[PDB]
Nucleic acid binder design. Structure first.
Lengths: 122, 184, 137
RNA sequence: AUGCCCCGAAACCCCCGGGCUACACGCGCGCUACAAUGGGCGGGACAAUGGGACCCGACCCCGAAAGGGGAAGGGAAUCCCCUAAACCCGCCCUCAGUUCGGAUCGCGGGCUGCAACUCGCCCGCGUGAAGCUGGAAUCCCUAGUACCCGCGUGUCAUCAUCGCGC
RNA sequence: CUCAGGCGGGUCAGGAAUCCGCCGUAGAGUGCAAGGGCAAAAGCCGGCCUGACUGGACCCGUAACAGAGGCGGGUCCAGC
């Protein structure tokens, strides 16, 4: 089925301005947008806008894990820092309104081995 | 999908009246999978939905993985024929959207599908005895003179010209009622 | 009058010796608060023993459950205040509610979010400590 | 604070991101409960210690709640936090995994903070896991003490099942 | 009434549960070894029954040709 967010299609979401996107988004994202964007986030937006317009062909890397995905960021690969490397994340329509850091896991899955000598009172 | 032979095969159906087939039987199966009170619930459900008695299809061979034993009544089935079969097929096909997968048709123009919940004049009377809702529905077509291979006396084999095909079956379904899809 | 020991509302059998509030509570998707809300909207005394309900009253309850908001229920007392797809206010009952929650978790797992990963792994998702508690084995 | 040894363009100094918050498992100390010596609803009474300047904030208006806007007085025996709970009266529940239990999750609305996903707190509706009194063993306490029940403060931009007192 | 096995289709259902079509000379089954025989049956599913009976005759095999106590089998008459 065609993707829709709050009954709006992707083209409508792109055409909508920042205030309407904030209205659509949940309380946390709306509050973040209302407060504003930090200078690093503004630089990230400038890079994404240039890439979309077609004058930035290099991969996009950033440390901004607290950034919320916007519809204009759909269709791009962003390399998000996770502490050690820049893991790639492909922006999808269903990921709008989520924090960019949710898709860049930091820790690793644990495969517990045999318990040590001190793991028990014996 | 798109059938390319619709026009000339329409000329054919109209030119030869006896070449027009019909739904000889619609078979509905309830694969309960266990011989419990759910089996009786499904039996009464199909009894009040169709109007004729059920059949206790027993299990062939024993399999402990599925929790079955040979000869255990597992599933039930019912066969519908005639104008009442026509009406039941219409209501069932309306239950879900009037769309059939174009690939579901057999080689001999036989089609069928499955419904995972009663929705056809269903009646919310399911809390008393329901829970095993779900039904495999398959329809069989036939040009009129196919009882030659069924009659005991002077039984014979129908030629390949006189038997249905996938395209003819789907076009017949389209012409009578409902539409096909591209299944992707 | 006709005191029914068992009454079926919204496809779930309700007790006949229990008040209407807690009787409606038997349906997944409705609790004591929302049941009282529904009774007050329908105009039925919440304290009546379930079983005295008539066909008209049962159908009225069904309609209220179908469209709680249009019947006066506040938009902030519903189960789904803002549908992800349609963008309207909905209240889901039993099977539809289960499908909606399953779809939400499946969407998370599909987008590969942290909360989806944690859902599939079966570990806490809301930011708890897993060193001393949550021992399932 | 300091002896010797060591690093001394690095172990020194700043900045960004992550971690200290992981999780088959063993343990200490606690909170909540396993209900009638009670749960819910409406109503009716009673404190003290302390703190308050980007601070406490009466009072008024909006909101269903969280919360939002204006704003008097108070440098504090003058104003605020501050009309606590246990307890009492009337009604429903009548021994049941329930109108006990409140983990675990969905959606949505807010506050602080430059920043809330890793990794904060708050409120609405929905959901409803173990638990029906506990083996060997083991701990505190001699009077306004023990038990029961709430409040102030230190940490604090937000966060108290925590320490110190009432 | 027709089997085994296979091809195409169908909600849970997956290699394998129950179902709808086509092909299918027996590749199945027939209590048990092997061989032989069996497809509108000798196989699968049902209805009724107890000829798995009584009194007898003759004949073949064990034992060719070529002798036999005991035993197995075949063709019949009568009774019920």
């Amino acid at each position: 089925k065609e993707f829709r967010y709050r009954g709006y299609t992707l083209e409508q979401l792109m055409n909508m301005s920042l205030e309407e996107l904030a209205r659509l988004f949940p309380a946390r994202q709306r509050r973040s947008l209302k407060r504003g964007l930090t200078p690093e986030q503004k630089k990230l937006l400038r890079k994404i806008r240039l890439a979309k317009k077609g004058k930035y062909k290099k991969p996009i890397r950033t440390h901004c894990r607290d950034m919320i995905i916007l519809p204009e960021m759909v269709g791009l690969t962003i390399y998000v820092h996770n502490g050690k490397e820049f893991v790639p994340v492909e922006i999808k329509p269903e990921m709008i309104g989520h924090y960019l850091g949710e898709f860049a896991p930091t820790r690793k899955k644990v495969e517990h081995g045999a318990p040590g000598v001190g793991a028990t009172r014996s | 999908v798109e059938i390319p032979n619709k026009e000339q095969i329409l000329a054919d159906w109209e030119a030869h009246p006896m070449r027009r087939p019909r739904i000889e039987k619609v078979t509905i199966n309830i694969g309960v999978g266990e011989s419990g009170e759910r089996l009786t619930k499904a039996e009464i459900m199909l009894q009040q939905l169709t109007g004729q008695k059920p059949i206790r299809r027993k299990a062939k061979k024993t399999n402990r993985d599925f929790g079955i034993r040979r000869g255990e009544p597992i599933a039930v089935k019912v066969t519908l024929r005639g104008p009442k079969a026509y009406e039941l097929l219409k209501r069932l096909l309306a239950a879900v959207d009037n769309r059939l997968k174009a690939s579901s048709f057999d080689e001999h123009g036989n089609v069928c599908f499955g419904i995972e919940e009663h929705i056809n004049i269903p009646g919310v009377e399911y809390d008393p005895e329901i829970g095993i809702f779900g039904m495999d529905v398959c329809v069989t077509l036939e040009r009129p003179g196919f009882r030659v291979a069924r009659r005991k006396r002077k039984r014979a084999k129908i030629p390949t010209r006189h038997k249905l095909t996938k395209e003819e079956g789907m076009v017949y379904m389209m012409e009578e009622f409902g539409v096909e899809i591209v299944e992707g | 009058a006709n005191f029914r020991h068992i009454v079926r509302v919204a496809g779930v059998d309700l007790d006949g010796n229990k008040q209407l509030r807690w009787a409606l509570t038997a349906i997944k998707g409705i609790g004591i608060n929302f049941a009282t809300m529904v009774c007050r909207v329908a105009g039925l005394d919440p304290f009546m023993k379930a079983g005295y309900l008539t066909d008209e009253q049962v159908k009225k309850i069904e309609e209220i459950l179908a469209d709680p908001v249009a019947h006066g229920i506040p938009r902030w007392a519903v189960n789904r205040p803002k549908d992800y797809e349609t963008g309207r206010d909905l209240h889901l009952i039993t099977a539809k509610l289960d499908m909606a929650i399953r779809e939400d978790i499946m969407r998370l797992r599909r987008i590969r979010a942290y909360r989806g990963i944690r859902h599939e792994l079966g570990l806490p998702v809301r930011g708890q400590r897993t060193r001393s508690n949550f021992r399932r084995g």
